[PDB]
Ligand binder design. Sequence first.
Ligand SMILES: [Mg+2]
Ligand SMILES: [Mg+2]
Ligand SMILES: [Mg+2]
Ligand SMILES: [Mg+2]
Ligand SMILES: [Mg+2]
Ligand SMILES: [Mg+2]
Ligand SMILES: [Mg+2]
Ligand SMILES: [Mg+2]
Ligand SMILES: [Mg+2]
Ligand SMILES: [Mg+2]
Ligand SMILES: [Mg+2]
Ligand SMILES: [Mg+2]
Ligand SMILES: [Mg+2]
Ligand SMILES: [Mg+2]
Ligand SMILES: [Mg+2]
Ligand SMILES: [Mg+2]
Ligand SMILES: [Mg+2]
Ligand SMILES: [Mg+2]
Ligand SMILES: [Mg+2]
Ligand SMILES: [Mg+2]
Ligand SMILES: [Mg+2]
Ligand SMILES: [Mg+2]
Ligand SMILES: [Mg+2]
Ligand SMILES: [Mg+2]
Ligand SMILES: [Mg+2]
Ligand SMILES: [Mg+2]
Ligand SMILES: [Mg+2]
Ligand SMILES: [Mg+2]
Lengths: 109, 176, 97, 111, 189, 46
Amino acid sequence: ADRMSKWTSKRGPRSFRGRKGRGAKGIGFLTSGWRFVQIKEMVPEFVVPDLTGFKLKPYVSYLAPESEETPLTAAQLFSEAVAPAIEKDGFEPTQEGKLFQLYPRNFLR
Amino acid sequence: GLEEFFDDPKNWGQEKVKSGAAWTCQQLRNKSNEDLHKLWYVLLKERNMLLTLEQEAKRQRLPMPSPERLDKVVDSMDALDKVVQEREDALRLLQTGQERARPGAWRRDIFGRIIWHKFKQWVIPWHLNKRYNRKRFFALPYVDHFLRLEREKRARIKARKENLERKKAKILLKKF
Amino acid sequence: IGIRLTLPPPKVVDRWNEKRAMFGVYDNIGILGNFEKHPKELIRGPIWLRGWKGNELQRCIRKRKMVGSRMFADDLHNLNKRIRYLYKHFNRHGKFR
Amino acid sequence: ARNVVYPLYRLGGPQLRVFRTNFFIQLVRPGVAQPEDTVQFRIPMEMTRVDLRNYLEGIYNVPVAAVRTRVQHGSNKRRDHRNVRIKKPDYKVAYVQLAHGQTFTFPDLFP
Amino acid sequence: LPPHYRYGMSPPGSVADKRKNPPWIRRRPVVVSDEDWYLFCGDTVEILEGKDAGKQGKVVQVIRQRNWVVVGGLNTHYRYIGKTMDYRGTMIPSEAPLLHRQVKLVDPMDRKPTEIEWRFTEAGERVRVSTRSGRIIPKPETWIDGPKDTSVEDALERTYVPCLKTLQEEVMEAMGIKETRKYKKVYWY
Amino acid sequence: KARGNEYQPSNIKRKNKHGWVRRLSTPAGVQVILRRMLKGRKSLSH
RNA sequence: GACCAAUCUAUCACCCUAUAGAAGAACUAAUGUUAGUAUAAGUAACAUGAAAACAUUCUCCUCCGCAUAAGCCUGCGUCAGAUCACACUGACAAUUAACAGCCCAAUAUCUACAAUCAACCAACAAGUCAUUAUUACCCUCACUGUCAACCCAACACAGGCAUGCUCAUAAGGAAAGGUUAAAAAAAGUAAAAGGAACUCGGCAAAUCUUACCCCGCCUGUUUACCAAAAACAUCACCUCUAGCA
RNA sequence: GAACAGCUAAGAGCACACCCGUCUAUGUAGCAAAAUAGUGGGAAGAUUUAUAGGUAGAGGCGACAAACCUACCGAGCCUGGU
RNA sequence: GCUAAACCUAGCCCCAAACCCACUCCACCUUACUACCAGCAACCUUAGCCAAACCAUUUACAUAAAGUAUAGGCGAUAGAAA
Ligand SMILES: [Mg+2]
Ligand SMILES: [Mg+2]
Ligand SMILES: [Mg+2]
Ligand SMILES: [Mg+2]
Ligand SMILES: [Mg+2]
Ligand SMILES: [Mg+2]
Ligand SMILES: [Mg+2]
Ligand SMILES: [Mg+2]
Ligand SMILES: [Mg+2]
Ligand SMILES: [Mg+2]
Ligand SMILES: [Mg+2]
Ligand SMILES: [Mg+2]
Ligand SMILES: [Mg+2]
Ligand SMILES: [Mg+2]
Ligand SMILES: [Mg+2]
Ligand SMILES: [Mg+2]
Ligand SMILES: [Mg+2]
Ligand SMILES: [Mg+2]
Ligand SMILES: [Mg+2]
Ligand SMILES: [Mg+2]
Ligand SMILES: [Mg+2]
Ligand SMILES: [Mg+2]
Ligand SMILES: [Mg+2]
Ligand SMILES: [Mg+2]
Ligand SMILES: [Mg+2]
Ligand SMILES: [Mg+2]
Ligand SMILES: [Mg+2]
Ligand SMILES: [Mg+2]
């Protein structure tokens, strides 16, 4: 009997305690006989490259110069990638069957 | 290895570190994608190390040598994330001209307030999903009274703030 | 104790203020301004009244029939309650009858 | 990552990738002296067991054998002058166990 | 922080400041305006009120939150710092703030208290200019690399190549990972 | 007998008798939640 | 009818006063409201078993204690300061699943002989547990609960709380702050002769008990919170209504 | 779904747990805005109870107590008319 | 002299004037802050207190005309336009 007490998994009964739970993000499902199925495709794979011979460092030196901030826009990217437009003197309009679709967020981060 | 969770043992017990200057936005924009990913990974490792050091210091009941480095690492991570988001937004605008990565649309719930409904992504269409069918979207007429009451409360708050600013300006003028 | 102790600061008062020095000016324009504007239009106040004394109940009915069309819900309800109470207290309660 | 919508894998979809991880992790000192080669970790909420396993195996390459996570509850018996409750931030805890009997010991600082 | 925060001499992040202004104070906020500030930290100023009404010094701190300016070696009040134990201890002359107007800026060679204007010059653009004459009053006022420091040229290589290739796809192509599977269409409601 | 003990706490019955679903099924609970939001309370319903 | 304490307004005042405009304009009381403080009052209520090297030992009680569904959320462990002395104030971290929860692809389709040691004996209240053929399916250990002296009664409340367990022991606790025992009351031990003769009543405590009248079939329920019945209900009888999904 | 020792031997009898409280005494700003012991009736059945859902006032329910419906029900409180 | 006594600035009411707000990141109608899979939903004469000493028909939601006509258990009252 508390309104300010935020409802969580440490309050309700066994049913709601095991149903809700913290941000678990369902990775698989159950198969009748309480036999969870770990879908290998849904398990994330941390793509970590090799940090061999890295030049930069997580900290910069104050001796470096200072430059103005200019948020990149679509016009600048178009002006940069302007090779075929000038050669006229390749584009992906429809990307429904593409690997990582742009408009519908299908790629993680 | 687990040794990466801590800095150079030679620096253990000094209350001073020589490292600062966070990665600005222009410096991150002037870099490739692989270099940006490597820098992000190194910054994440440094953040993990600094968080472990902070927890150890809190457990040992001692102050921090210099959280400025942690603040600068967090700022650099935020700047890298913002640059990546801006690049993705530019690519999306040049590919389809669609605003906001996550799709959505405006809708009217029961309260009537125009809320930006967020898509949950499903497998089956909407004309047969039992759960989504229950999530109706209409305010009905009787909620007009509550909407008018909320609008009147907002107008009262705005008028109160305006009179407050006017009285403050009058008092300031009286003082001089 | 109810009475305070230390006296107050010197309440400065500018008798020759911009409003005081011009208070009552440009009034009575009708008797000598070939009658062009009534003094009742000079006062700056409510819109439902601007040159009519009246009374409490009468002023309330005026504000209702002149501003009630754009008044808030709670304000309109309070005004109606006040009008009804004033009517019940005037046309029934009282003395000399 | 954390606080980000994931792509629902139907059936014949590609392998789920995770570029530029958001959530972080940090180890702490054993509370009641844990067994050998048993490292503790304070994991946020949006993180599972296999997630941490892959995270470690990909970043630090630590030969993680078994993991056993759990959620901890934050204190809440404290009020300010306003008589308002204060719930500390909750976090998940894990007990990673190295393989091959590497035998790891929690290092100490501030000599 | 809550509104009407009486900014004291101590910064808004010290133990003394927190002890002075606990989270249950409701004092009377002092009235202060004056957005075009000009008194910076380290400027030759001259006091014209109270003690040392003429002696020049140097500004140390400038708390613009309440229009306060601290000068070095002027308007100092003595204090028994700490004292740790129950005895004499040691006395130190602690400075005090001073509101603007009363404390004006000092000229280079003239060395007199005069008002400064914000004239838009051709140098781009607004700069201090005395009233008695020109005199552009200037503003007031080494790092060896470390183990985790980048450099001076690595951060200016400019390796970005604008190409519609996406970061995820580029990383996948660089790492050599292959995935012939296709992403079937999904619903969004 | 002791009449100072009538409360039998149970999250199930509590959420079933005063739940968002039950408060939005009928217009009664809708008006209740609207009035609560207009009043300015922190918690709208259990 | 004659004056007048306070305020704002327009008038020279300016160690506090005058002319006119206004009343939310003037308190010994309305078992009036808010804040502190007298009054019974330092009176009623109150705890902490003993020795001691504070290691440890001794005396007594126990229908209580163990784990769990319901319920709470860190609520007598450490670190420094606060004090019947402290569970009080700030940091420390716990509680890691194998126990329980989080659970079932479709189409036609069918389970007459209950359980009660179920075989003798059977009975009425007729009863809790099953699958057949085809299609497609082959990746497998993800998430939550795990503490305490604990829940609901405004209190640290002789009060209320289910399941499997020895119910007195391997669990669980201390009725006596220290002195004397004035008066009154209550819970217990015994009583020289009577055993109900004070009392409207055999109404507390002990025997353990014989024969009657009224009413109620007997069980069961009622006015939770003063009346628990000679009232309420029916196994038995009887009146009326209804020819149907 | 759960509970009902044992003893004598059937909506049988005594009696554990357990259900309610006919009576005394204490309490009456107390342990309690309804408590403490036995004498009390039942305790394989009109029996008690853990969980969930349904019956809401011109109403529901009611082995009629014109009783109960969140401490005060000859009809619980709130809102707006008041 | 213990306990006490005062500070006034944050903000409030009136109209005078415009017509207001509203998605960075995940989460929210199932048990709200829950990534995930086969089924009806809408439009309703408001009553009532009170006054006629009860009470049923009755009782209110710029200026002048005018509180006139008119309606009214023709009594308490209501009350327009050209
Ligand atoms: Mg009580
Ligand atoms: Mg008085
Ligand atoms: Mg009295
Ligand atoms: Mg009085
Ligand atoms: Mg007395
Ligand atoms: Mg004791
Ligand atoms: Mg436990
Ligand atoms: Mg004593
Ligand atoms: Mg004898
Ligand atoms: Mg005798
Ligand atoms: Mg006698
Ligand atoms: Mg006699
Ligand atoms: Mg007798
Ligand atoms: Mg007998
Ligand atoms: Mg009978
Ligand atoms: Mg009674
Ligand atoms: Mg009785
Ligand atoms: Mg009967
Ligand atoms: Mg019968
Ligand atoms: Mg009796
Ligand atoms: Mg009495
Ligand atoms: Mg009986
Ligand atoms: Mg019996
Ligand atoms: Mg028995
Ligand atoms: Mg009622
Ligand atoms: Mg009346
Ligand atoms: Mg009447
Ligand atoms: Mg007209």
